From Swiss-Prot, chains A, B:
Its cofactor is Mg(2+); Mn(2+); Fe(2+); Ni(2+). PANTHER family: CRISPR-ASSOCIATED ENDORIBONUCLEASE CAS2 (PTHR34405), CRISPR-ASSOCIATED ENDORIBONUCLEASE CAS2 3 (PTHR34405:SF3). Its EC number is 3.1.-.-. Homodimer, forms a heterotetramer with a Cas1 homodimer. Binds 1 Mg(2+) per homodimer, shared between the Asp-10 pair; divalent cations support activity in decreasing order, Mg(2+) >> Mn(2+) > Fe(2+) > Ni(2+) > Ca(2+). One of its GO terms (molecular function) is protein homodimerization activity. It comes from the Bacteria. This is CRISPR-associated endonuclease Cas2. Optimum pH is 7-10. InterPro entries: CRISPR_associated_Cas2 (IPR021127), Virulence_VapD/CRISPR_Cas2 (IPR019199). Keywords: Antiviral defense, Endonuclease, Hydrolase, Magnesium, Metal-binding, Nuclease. Inhibited by EDTA and Zn(2+). Activated by high concentrations of monovalent cation with a preference for K(+) over Na(+).
Length: 84, 84
């Protein structure tokens, strides 16, 4: 029924900063920002599709990438500071 | 026996660029760089510990963070370009 999904956004620039803000807002609707451009979302199948379409539409595909990991869910270890 | 591990490195600066190079080299010993600062490693338990100690030692814990996800392993979707 519910899935944990990890979204990793590789973004650099003015456009980049703007796109990160938008991607973060879209992911926040379904989860939490755990690093500057890494998001953990908990979603059903319909919500995953909706979110993935939205994220695909927000990035610059020449300059950015996203990876979407379906985790199905084991302690994740966080090492170091933040995020802001 | 073997585990897939995802390593997400939140790093910014001159020191940052240097630390990313070192983290990437450490992860390359056990896997692949799939985005600028995201690495997929396949490791046994001993290798995971060794790698995690090494990564912890390389980062600046005031300015950077790492997350280490143990995936146990479902198509990951890559959207957009790269990495360099």
């Amino acid at each position: 029924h519910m899935m944990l999904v990890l979204i990793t956004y590789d973004v650099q620039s003015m456009g980049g900063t703007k796109r990160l803000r938008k991607v973060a807002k879209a992911c926040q609707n379904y989860g939490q920002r755990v690093q500057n451009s890494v998001f953990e979302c908990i979603v059903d199948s319909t919500q995953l599709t909706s979110l993935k379409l939205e994220l695909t539409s927000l990035i610059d595909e020449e300059k950015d990438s996203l990876r979407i990991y379906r985790l199905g869910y084991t302690k994740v270890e966080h090492i170091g500071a933040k995020p802001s």
